[PDB]
Amino acid sequence: TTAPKPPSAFTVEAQRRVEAELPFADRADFERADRGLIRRPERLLIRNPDGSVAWQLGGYDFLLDGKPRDSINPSLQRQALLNLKYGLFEVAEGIYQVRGFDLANITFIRGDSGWIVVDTLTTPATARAAYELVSRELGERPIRTVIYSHAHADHFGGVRGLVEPQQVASGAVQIIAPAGFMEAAIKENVLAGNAMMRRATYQYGTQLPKGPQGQVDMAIGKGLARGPLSLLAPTRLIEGEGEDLVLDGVPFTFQNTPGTESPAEMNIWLPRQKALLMAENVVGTLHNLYTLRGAEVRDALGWSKYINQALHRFGRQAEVMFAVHNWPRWGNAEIVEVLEKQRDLYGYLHDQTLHLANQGVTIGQVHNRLRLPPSLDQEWYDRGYHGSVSHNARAVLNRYLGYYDGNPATLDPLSPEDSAGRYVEYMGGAERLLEQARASYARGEYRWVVEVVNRLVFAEPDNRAARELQADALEQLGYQAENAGWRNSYLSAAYELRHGVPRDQGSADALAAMDTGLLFDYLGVRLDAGAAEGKALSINLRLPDIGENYLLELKNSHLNNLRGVQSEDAGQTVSIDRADLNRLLLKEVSAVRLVFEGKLKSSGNPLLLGQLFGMLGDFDFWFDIVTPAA
Amino acid sequence: TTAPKPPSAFTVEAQRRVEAELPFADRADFERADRGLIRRPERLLIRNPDGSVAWQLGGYDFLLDGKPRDSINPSLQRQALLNLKYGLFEVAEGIYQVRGFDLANITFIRGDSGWIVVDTLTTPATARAAYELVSRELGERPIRTVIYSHAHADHFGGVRGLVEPQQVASGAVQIIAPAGFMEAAIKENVLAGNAMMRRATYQYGTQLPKGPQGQVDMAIGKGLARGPLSLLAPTRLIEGEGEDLVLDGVPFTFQNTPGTESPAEMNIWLPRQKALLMAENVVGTLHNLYTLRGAEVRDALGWSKYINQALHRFGRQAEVMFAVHNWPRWGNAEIVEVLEKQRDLYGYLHDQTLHLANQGVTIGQVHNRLRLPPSLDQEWYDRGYHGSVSHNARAVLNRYLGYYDGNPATLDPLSPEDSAGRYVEYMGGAERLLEQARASYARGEYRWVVEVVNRLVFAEPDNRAARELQADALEQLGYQAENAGWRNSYLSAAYELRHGVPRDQGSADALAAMDTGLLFDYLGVRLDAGAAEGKALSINLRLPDIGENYLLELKNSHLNNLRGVQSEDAGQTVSIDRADLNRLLLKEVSAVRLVFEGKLKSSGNPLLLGQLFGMLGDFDFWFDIVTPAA
Ligand SMILES: CCCCCCCCCCCCO
Ligand SMILES: CCCCCCCCCCCCO
Ligand SMILES: [Zn+2]
Numbered sequence A, B: 001t002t003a004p005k006p007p008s009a010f011t012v013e014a015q016r017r018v019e020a021e022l023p024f025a026d027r028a029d030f031e032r033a034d035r036g037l038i039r040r041p042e043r044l045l046i047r048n049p050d051g052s053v054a055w056q057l058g059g060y061d062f063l064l065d066g067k068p069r070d071s072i073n074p075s076l077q078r079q080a081l082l083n084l085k086y087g088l089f090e091v092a093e094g095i096y097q098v099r100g101f102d103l104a105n106i107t108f109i110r111g112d113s114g115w116i117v118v119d120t121l122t123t124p125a126t127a128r129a130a131y132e133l134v135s136r137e138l139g140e141r142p143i144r145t146v147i148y149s150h151a152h153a154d155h156f157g158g159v160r161g162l163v164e165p166q167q168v169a170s171g172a173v174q175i176i177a178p179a180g181f182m183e184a185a186i187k188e189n190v191l192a193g194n195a196m197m198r199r200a201t202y203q204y205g206t207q208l209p210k211g212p213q214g215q216v217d218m219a220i221g222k223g224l225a226r227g228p229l230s231l232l233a234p235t236r237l238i239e240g241e242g243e244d245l246v247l248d249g250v251p252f253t254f255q256n257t258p259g260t261e262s263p264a265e266m267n268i269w270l271p272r273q274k275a276l277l278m279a280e281n282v283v284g285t286l287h288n289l290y291t292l293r294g295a296e297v298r299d300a301l302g303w304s305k306y307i308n309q310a311l312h313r314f315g316r317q318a319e320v321m322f323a324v325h326n327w328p329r330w331g332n333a334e335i336v337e338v339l340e341k342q343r344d345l346y347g348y349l350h351d352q353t354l355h356l357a358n359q360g361v362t363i364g365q366v367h368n369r370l371r372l373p374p375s376l377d378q379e380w381y382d383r384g385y386h387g388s389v390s391h392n393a394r395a396v397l398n399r400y401l402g403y404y405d406g407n408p409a410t411l412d413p414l415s416p417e418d419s420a421g422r423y424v425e426y427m428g429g430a431e432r433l434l435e436q437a438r439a440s441y442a443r444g445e446y447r448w449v450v451e452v453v454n455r456l457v458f459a460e461p462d463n464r465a466a467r468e469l470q471a472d473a474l475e476q477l478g479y480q481a482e483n484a485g486w487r488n489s490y491l492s493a494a495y496e497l498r499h500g501v502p503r504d505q506g507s508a509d510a511l512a513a514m515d516t517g518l519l520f521d522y523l524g525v526r527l528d529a530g531a532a533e534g535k536a537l538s539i540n541l542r543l544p545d546i547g548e549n550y551l552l553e554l555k556n557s558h559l560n561n562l563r564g565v566q567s568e569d570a571g572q573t574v575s576i577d578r579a580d581l582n583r584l585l586l587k588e589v590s591a592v593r594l595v596f597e598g599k600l601k602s603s604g605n606p607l608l609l610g611q612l613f614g615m616l617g618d619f620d621f622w623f624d625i626v627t628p629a630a
């Protein structure tokens, strides 16, 4: 069968254990999530200009009765329902948020003559919808300032839904961001982007239905709205430790926390309302030190210290703490306790992972040994809905010691598809393997089953009996999973094992923000080494609009670029505005028209740039993950 | 049997293949390594003040005839012999090096009135021995300036063998380093230090004899001298991009390359001799993007660009290039070609790893797919003696995508000791497993054997037949290994499987260089969470000599420290000079004597600091690696 199966007796037992172990009697979040509600629109259906749907919430109606479903981890089901508390809310005097219009929240702070807005959602249509709700309930005001709390797309993505370049150019609107914003907004998504985006189909469960045996939540929100990605450059940067500014009569203290949840990030303290906006440093979950879709590892230590710094500066005196995801927390004692526990959560993960590592516990063991102490374990905002204790501990370890467990048995490993046939042969052939795996499956040993049956799938990818058993076991693990990313991954893997990978199949703002060096670095990543072999060429590239020059050198099957250097011996010198190069790579203009408009100029050998571009390859999106390359 | 076995017919075949595939007819390095030889002392035996031996070379006599030994990869054997070309050499007019007195080289540059010395070896006795050889052959001169090329112990470790603090304090001697030196010298060795040092016993093969079936070389040198680690703070830092200075009449151009082989590193150009000293950016091997002992991953991209920057600034005009490890290369065309190929080597590894990753190739596959192009493959200085193509490719991948392969079968893995019993049961029990593994072994399938028999060892660690077969297969892989670290790891693992882990079992300068925040971070890593559970305490710590204050807070089984903060509600306030705290942790003084000298003062509850220290645990050095914890 290729449809989801019911939860097994073991999965059911696992859900009852969760209820036994976690403080469900602490229901305070349900009152917190509804506090200050001004309007929850009856439905939410947000549409893009091209007619697609940006966002949605009706697919989540199954969650509304609050009835526990054994195909959902009851802790995750609690979070899933809390994330359904959407609409326009009051946080404090003159501070509002729109939650559940997208993955993130959008915040509106009343200035004397209009709004200061913190963050802008993922896509213009969701930001625009949030702004329309605000205007309907609170009266229309102009937006005078937009603040990006940090350099992630679920925060800057929707800016064009709120403001247009002409307003930024007139000085009608300011855009404020932490120093480092523009680099950080783009960099981490580029060089390994195709890998990350494909792997993210698992994390986000993009092929799963919304429902009890599909996608149910995404921890820091319901999921991510779909539509155009926009981005407008900051007009003012908050530098150094932070800054105190007054915006439209309202005092703001900005505290930079670079290198925590994002390389460019800042907390916001509002002294008049005693309101502490913790950016994405403190949300209603354990966050990722390592995003499963693939990314650099984050620094739990700095993360912990910056929360401590915010505690000692503001926690002190805060009457409400709130954030760019999830709901606020009111009352000084509560705020102090949340700050301490989150400081100690990232600190414990860091320190105790290292403590174990220093005792010989490896990257292949640490998640099965490290456990939070009761005081940290027993808070809802410490649960692993988004990050997990397990995958965070391995990330800390990977950060300090790397991927290699120190045992040379594992130093030069055969690819899984190359050892798989022998594992199957040693276990008696596929039928014998299946027979023993089915018995293990019947004992509820799903974490073992998915490991060993994965061998048979990699050896025999067209063995439907193996794919089906492996899917079944993954699905049970997904049902059991507290972490929304783990759930979506397990169910996505089960889906592809059962059905196969899909065979049927801008952003201009994002490209414009990309540094030219990084762009060239990306082109080097696209280079087909087979095509490049034995070639050598060099091109002086001049970009007059941005006043940069690059020297491009292809040699030894590698593309180099160097800023600020030109070579008297380059084979060709090309001049093109960066704006026009961008139009080229986005196919908004032809090379030929550009030459004819005198917008692309060349001296030397006219053919080299075309030769170089002719060597650049492309990446297919839907690569195989749960089987070897087909 | 528990003694090394001869190379198998397959290993022998593997060595003949190496000879077929690599340009052994290119013997130019042998003339390069002997060029400018002034004196090769007949023996080298260097002793420490405590009577130990620092260094070694007589144990390498087996290599001297140049006869190929089938238990050594012939490429590694070539390198091993080249690294035996030790003594005092002329590089250019007034530029000398002592090579083979330690892992690194020490360089002596003739000033008008004494020496400028670049780097200082690992330990004072080896630096002192190098200096004595210099004085014997070239005449005694004072050392007026010491330059640290970068922040690694094999470069700063021996400084006290050359100069003493009193000379630095009088201004008789200057010590020059790249900005960032003092942080970088210490930081990366602290938090996970016990893990790294134990794992390094494998990489360095510290338990192996010197000989054809033991340790033969360490790629960038013969091995590391053993003795006290010294460190003296720089008196002048090279900031920004670099600087041009004149030292004792000699012009120097310093080019910083932060974040390449070390976070603080600089190339040196000497315009009068047209001599280019490439720090540890370019040595006679592919270097590590990831050191197997365990470390953060390095940035191949920046590494590649900085070599390109040095090429375009100096390569241009260089008549000799030399380095802090291995031998020089003379002649402009040769220098230009080495710089290009090394730039493209790190660039190819970076770009092509990402190219593959973007196609779906995972961290578990990439090393079995990525291969250098011929132009890079066919140079001796590109061979993987120190770094490897294989482990570097996985590191690039780990850096961008992390440890997780995207396949949820592997998302929540059982520890090896917990799945091992089932692997053994599925394969028919230990005897059946051994039977099939011995047949695979007889086919020379050593990379498979070590994977599968490792399962049986982890299930049954006292199964001597399994340990013995696993050792045999690892040993063959070690014989075959071109990489000196891989060889030493494989033979070390074989040694422990056969014999067991050893059951019989300062640096004051290094501690003094450690930032106080990092020291406190380390103490938090030592915290026993079991002992800390349920406790809360806070201590204001004041360190008057360095004019720093810290707030220490223990809560939620985590130790926090915050620089520059004090709390009016701390339970205790302690004042102690940092110098004295250091003496305490190095047991050079008692807490009690310090109090009695008025060097440790307290107000508030006098017991808290002792309570905190009482919760701090210790790490055993000899943890198990090739078996589960005993
Ligand atoms: C194409 C795969 C669709 C999944 C969306 C993944 C993009 C994540 C960016 C938003 C989160 C920012 O931290
Ligand atoms: C205690 C284990 C002995 C092995 C020595 C490992 C220390 C490496 C430091 C020297 C290399 C600097 O990059
Ligand atoms: Zn974010």
Ligand SMILES: [Zn+2]
Pocket (backbone or CB within 6 Å): A104, A152, A154, A155, A280, A324, A325
């Ligand atoms: Zn976010």
Ligand SMILES: [Zn+2]
Pocket (backbone or CB within 6 Å): B150, B152, B261, B262, B280
């Ligand atoms: Zn080094």
Ligand SMILES: [Zn+2]
Pocket (backbone or CB within 6 Å): B104, B152, B154, B155, B280, B324, B325
């Ligand atoms: Zn070195």
